[model samples]
Target chain A: TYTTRQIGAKNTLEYKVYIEKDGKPVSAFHDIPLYADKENNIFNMVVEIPRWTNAKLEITKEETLNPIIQDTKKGKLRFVRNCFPHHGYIHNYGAFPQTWEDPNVSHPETKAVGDNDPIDVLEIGETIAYTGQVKQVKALGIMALLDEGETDWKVIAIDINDPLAPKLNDIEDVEKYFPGLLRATNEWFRIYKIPDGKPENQFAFSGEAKNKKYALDIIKETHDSWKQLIAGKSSDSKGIDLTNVTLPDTPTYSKAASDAIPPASLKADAPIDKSIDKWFFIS
Target chain B: TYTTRQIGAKNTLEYKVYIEKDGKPVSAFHDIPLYADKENNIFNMVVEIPRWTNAKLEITKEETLNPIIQDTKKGKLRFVRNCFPHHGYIHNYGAFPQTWEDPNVSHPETKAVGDNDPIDVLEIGETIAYTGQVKQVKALGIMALLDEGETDWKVIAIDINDPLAPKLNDIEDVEKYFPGLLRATNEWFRIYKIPDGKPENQFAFSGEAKNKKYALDIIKETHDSWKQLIAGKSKGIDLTNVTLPDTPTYSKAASDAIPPASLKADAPIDKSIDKWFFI
Candidate 1:
């Protein structure tokens, strides 16, 4: 099990979710193991954005210990458009820890490079996850999203402890169990940015979900990229901070830096904006 | 209470649907009464586009007999998007005969004028109804679609013969019988025209389905609007059903001249009939 310590203040831009394991600070981006059961294909999903809420929270790639922080645009906090029946995201959304989609590496089928972040995972499980919450999820399928000419793969997953977990084993199972959900999922990713003045996102293979085996292969490939990224071999690791309490003897790791990572206690922060509660209508 | 006759062709732009009553050629737009039972509030729905099909067909607003024709865009036969799982339309969609949303009049709630077409209805039944088939339906709810700044209300209804018909008396009954269907229906309307390179359609009430009481009120109000249209008090589309001798615009000479020139031998259907769109 994983733990989180809330730093800064609630709902504020300074608010950060510090990652921990048994009273020790760890890099959320690099310290957490990607898989819980490697043989059974059960992966660790570090949720950044919970279901029904939208703050675009992501792991800070350039921070020490890599705490979760909300992304900003034009100096304002960004929240996703409320697509009806889908307020923010239809599922608990996050990323597979310790897996990086290296932008420099090109995939044969996607015909483009990665989006330079941890591969996105949509936890279709009914439970609403919390930020910095780590849950073991079974990969059901994957959809290749060609977002702004970047190969952004969305792994469709379900919590292993979910009620209907055992009933789904492949992409076809999603179509059977949730008839219109996959269609909604694809349409969600395609037009979610339209309210923000961005054009409808394009997709690979007409937005059909690929099977679990293909999704696992992508996980493995991105894991390889992450391993290279931590070892100081990646082409663009200039802004990414590799400081961590774990993973000794790496090029960016140091005993002095690890000791000075977390403060004695988090200080107070400003309150969040009330306008974030506003809902948007798009045409 | 009324019947229809197939004229022109089946799947081409030349295809037309003529209305009749007991072998008499009547205007599908004008002669067909808006209500089958006015006292009970049960309305007549003229099915223009069946469930799961994509040809954009509608009753002609300008033709002699006001026959149904394939709606076109850029000189090409128009087909709606198959937003997967929805296919074409999740329900049998058509219009209420003898009712019009007058463009000249503004609705107090819609904040816009009408599209000048007969009020739209989506039959949320299990059966896939065919074109020109008149199905009796209960007006469970209504949604105001703000199409191009015009108030185009879509009535959510069900066939009286449907198994769940008794359970569904109003809009909330639709929620009870088929949950998430109202959302799907609203989403279908919002994004149906996106594949045609047009922007998503807008709605007046955040696309929420209004109550049944509100829907019946709309039916009564638009019914009055149609009466104005048939009586020549309206200013928009032409009304061909001058058979209503009670209305001021009734033209016996024009009504007699319409049948011979409008109804003809059904033309040859193109292979386009076999084509389908999966957007």
Candidate 2:
């Protein structure tokens, strides 16, 4: 039997459980397995990176399954270089632990495919989150990224207890208080791969989430997609088929010509050292 | 004689000045003047691009001098392309009027040189600022960019009246409430010039100004530098000597050779060819 401790109210409820082992009940720490309720629960935000910081923590599947396993134990935690030197992360970025976006899943409306990973999230608030801390947050918006042939979605949320949380009920509120935040978020994702020498135009931000309702719908849909994934369902689920969802067209630009004229003041060409991470100004 | 309009409390005070032109008092809009009070005045933020928008308003020296002139009248308001395609500004960006960071003026401590132009600013708030609206903003921090041997500072500020304004007194507050905002600002300035095929090591963000006080001090220093620039002072001024100012060293990287990698997968490098005054 498992006893539960509730942290929030209404639709935003989060839980901490105590489970019996060997006839003795112990607090089920977030790092333990079976802690996350898989019914599309909002409290199952698997905190990979806490708020108020910029160190990249890459979480893998085995760690997600056995929550009690430490990063050292799993050998999964590693730093993600900023593609180049001198750059850093711009948000408290992470992913939902129990949620998986299927790569085979295709959106009927926006025509977007999935990256086949857990749903990514960006938590907006002042409080610094602890690793594995399941937090109750309000969905603010979504940063839709079309990476390669996959639709990598980044859900934007605000912790309910944050000072400005009450004020930011939706995407509009996010824009109202944090004017350039969304654009910044979009820009971060768009060019993050550039420093790695990735081909441009291969990734784009599919901007179209107008309000909280839209974001909530995507969350719910993704949640259902996760459920379908867990249930081993082969066909599309209720929320998995986003055929009617509309998104902005991927921006297109002409490629630089192979025979393009080189500038007179340009430095002599040297082989780019792949091992060395070069720093470029972010503007 | 000049009449003034107060916008906020002391230390964060901003003003709107009305001046007499031909014996008649006319609104001495920020787009027109020598109105920026050099004593660390917070109200001197001449609104180049208003809040809640994404247009790049490039401000130049002549426009700063003739303060009474409107951008519409002068037809100087234009968009600066983001060096290449698929890239855009991350903030409502602009610069101060009647301000110039003299190229010859180097920081005494950091040994940094300056880029001769008005001090640049990134406004953080919900309010939509008009073209000539002079706003009172609290300096959150500074994104010091060393661009091609020039100190191009991007002062990050929040409107005093913004709901989050009181909470953000400095850089910590900015990081607290708006996580990644500073890093994002740094990122913006970092990649803004790359699409033009500029070398990465030639520029870097100094990443100093640990607090609002530090930012305020730089604001005052730049204001004095601007005054010296206009006054034709060949020597250094009091504020021009930044002894304690610490900035990051410019990054040095090995040059990339191999016939220079062409932007193969890059979308068409548009020259921003739509110049029919596409209003």
Candidate 3:
């Protein structure tokens, strides 16, 4: 069930809200947690890209359409450096339902903040968790990432019913059992920003993986963050906002930035400077 | 420059081609070797995703646009799974120029065959290689993958100029120096098919990483495969070959496969079936 109402100038923006059986828009955001089991700390995980697969998809807040972003800040949808049907994702990537990362809340260690998106989760299980199919996931670890200065935490977990779940206990167990996974996750966060021409150091993992207890704590904190956001405690909160916030009028891409960029030619730019060639070099 | 031409049936299909300065479409695919120095066995690699970075952009064989697959076999470019703007590729993925896998060829060891596409390459270097910028690379290993029954190989290489290139001589070196990279690449190939609803074992990497010599052998063999494709020796080859062999009319997706598919629902599904006891 869904309904749309115009809010901005001349209702230029179409804001859609999920409604109940009675045809009323779902008013209370916090009434439903991001997952089914907020009380017990278990989460209903949404698998965008299942384990060992790469096609990408995202669960929308209301609709089934998996929205892909063109620009991050201004939030335009026009495409460039566009899609590849062949490329695949490396992890079982998805997010927890009902959970929101309040951009206002600051992290203690990284001092960075959230992206005002749903809390992301990466499940590490043996079986393939089908897209849109919810799984019972236990918090195992958290990968604290600073993505473009945002505190994007990727919670790592295993399906509660997975046979491998019992053998693992916490982050330490993740290291003991799944040795390379942590590093892979780190590398994933490290490089995900690069293709967009982001600087190499723009993204960073905070530190070592946090234990299940720490993950649960972070989840609870984010749940509280959602509560605060709905309660109008968020610094950016205007009111009890339900629909997607309208972004400020922003420039898409400047011609100067586009023109100044040179095409990647086949030939070398110039002769290599020997002074900088302390090591082996090729052209 | 780029121009679009209608190939089949009264211009119903729009096929874009890269035009040269002489107002002619680029031709003779194999005349230009896949690698910069095929005789010396050095590839002029294009880095889609740079090492130590995850941004991905493909080097076009003839045009600036990275061609998206509409149908895997038939080569029609009508929209299906469509495009993505925000999602960045995980590996430093790209492909060699003037290269074709000749889907007809079969591997000796794995018995898996080609996907009739450009030979894909994965570069492991320290520097960020801009899109369309070609770099001299030496093959370190090959990851043999079968996507939807097509043999798709991801050749692992390092920029010859990279300081880290010397340290990595083989796949073992990939494991030794960049401890998690080989595993990461393997894991990437292993699970990349799953999100498309491919089975867990739908893709596989043939054995361990081959050495530089073996990498060279594979490159040379692929070069020969390209030659065979252009010479009309390939079983799959028809007339009118270009740098990128246009695909045949392949079915994109079917309905029987569609119904079982589930929307990524916000709410949870029912409990797990423990009887199978599968993980």
Candidate 4:
């Protein structure tokens, strides 16, 4: 069992990761535990911080993030999978990351989401698919917002063992995976992205056709052989394209964006960039 | 301000009804207080017993049929409405109740049903027009059964302010009120005489024709008047008796039909006699 102890009174958070497969515990190379704590009766599990791209890409030796431990109020803990971050103000990609926990290891739990909360992030490298289980804590206290500003996070707790993921090929596949969540008002989700993001990004897909084609081609080259290797099925891969595959134009930051001054504090005479393309990668 | 105190190991089970409308406190006639020891943590409030006759009718006098509280840990509390009791059996005729509140005068809170466990009682009742507010509590502790050989008890929590009660013109009205509590279940309610020897009864009609005639007369007398009272535009009642109205039979002494037995000992057989011409 991972022991729980207090960190410094104010800084630093701790978390512990228990990896289980087929209903039993398994060891994973964890560099940083995914959790932190506040003296207030609250705990934060920092899941999928994008900085670990090398580890996430399987290019580094550390396959798993580190685990942190902190004291809790004698109750079971749970994580809410909120996939989307910003809407129209950020980007217009409709396909957002969806959270999945292995049913054998992670248990289902209940959590109340604030009106403006973001779901935890789950990432995929275009082709690779992952699954895990979750544990549920009934009647859990609501997690308050950690940062200020209009929050629009929504959490979905999903069981990952179902065969629906591998079968998802189109928009209908996405809706079938999460039947109840799709609303009539958000009818445009079955496609890709919405222009204004009126309905928050339900799913994420590459905004540009070139990126999508490249991503799909990459999947065909790498995952196709990997699938056949595992399932012992053979398929012809004659016309597959691999070299032209490019990353989606979706925002990829070299470093964390600096916090802008509150809009109220900005000078009225300040010259703002007039070109929209100034924020684009190519521009 | 009432000072907060840790609930005692023994006194934690006691609870009292505290009604709030919109957001402020309201009063209830049968709002009785309950008490308990450490054995039970959750208690269910059952208002419907001895039959479906409106508790408001019984509450006209100051007689005490105090709220029956059952602990949730031991057994389940099935809240059924609009169903008639027959020979200690309750045939559910309406929807299940939705939304339950802990009647703690101090910190009364409400909980919503998640993961529709029993089918969606509301959708079933909606097909029929039994629109009534059906609310139930599942006590965590086991309470004495109403009679021998009984699997479940029909316990109801009545809300006089329910908007749907006035619309129940037929058996379907019962299904509309509490859809969550009574979906897809044929088993009705049975009221057994408690150890305290209380005389409770379910309503009865002379026969189908007589009840139908009574319903017609009621519609003729009350419907137009009620419409005028609410809308200030009274449209006369227009219903032709294309089919003969069937009168509903009544069962008196619903609680007296059976006796209670020990939960652990040899289960005593139900002593209720089989009868015809009446439920």
> What local distance difference test score does each model get?
0.78, 0.48, 0.50, 0.21
Expressed as tens digits, the lDDT of each residue in A1-283 for candidate 1 is: 4688787765567778877777666788888889899889899889999865667889989888888998889887777865433456667899998889887778999789888898899987655678999899999899999987789999999999877789999989987777778888987898888878888888898898999989999999999999999998888975888876667867877546545545535566454454443333343
Model 3: docking quality category: incorrect
Docking tier of model 1: it is incorrect
Candidate 3 stretches with Cα past 4 Å from truth are A1-40, A49-87, A201-206, A238-283, B1-279
- Model 2 misplaced regions, further than 4 Å: A1-42, A51-55, A62-78, A81-87, A200-206, A234-279, B1-279
Task: Give the per-residue lDDT digits (tens) of candidate 1, residues B5-60.
Answer: 66555656767776666656677777777777878778888899887576788988
Question: Which residue pairs in candidate 1 collide?
Answer: none
Residues forming the 10-long window of minimal summed lDDT in candidate 2 chain B: B249-258
Candidate 3 displacement at residue B158 in angstroms = 16
TM-score of chain A by itself in each prediction: 0.92, 0.61, 0.62, 0.21
TM-score of chain B of each: 0.88, 0.60, 0.60, 0.22
User: Candidate 1, which segments miss by more than 4 Å at Cα?
Assistant: A255-283, B1-279
What C-alpha lDDT, on a 0 to 100 scale, does residue A195 get in candidate 2?
A: 52
Per-prediction share of native contacts kept: 0.00, 0.00, 0.00, 0.00
Better of 2 and 3 by DockQ: 3
- Top candidate on lDDT is 1
Q: Name the 10 consecutive residues with the lowest summed lDDT in model 1 chain A.
A: A274-283
True contacts kept of 2: 0.00
Task: Estimate the TM-score for candidate 3.
Answer: 0.42
Writing each residue's lDDT as its tens digit, candidate 4 over A1-283 gives 2221212221112223332323222222121111222121111222222211111111111212111222222342221111121111111011111111111121112122212111332221111121111211011111112121222222221113223334543333433544422332132222112222323333222211112233323222332332332232334322211111011221221111112101111112222122211111110
Query: Which window of ten consecutive residues has the lowest lDDT sum in model 4 chain A?
Result: A86-95
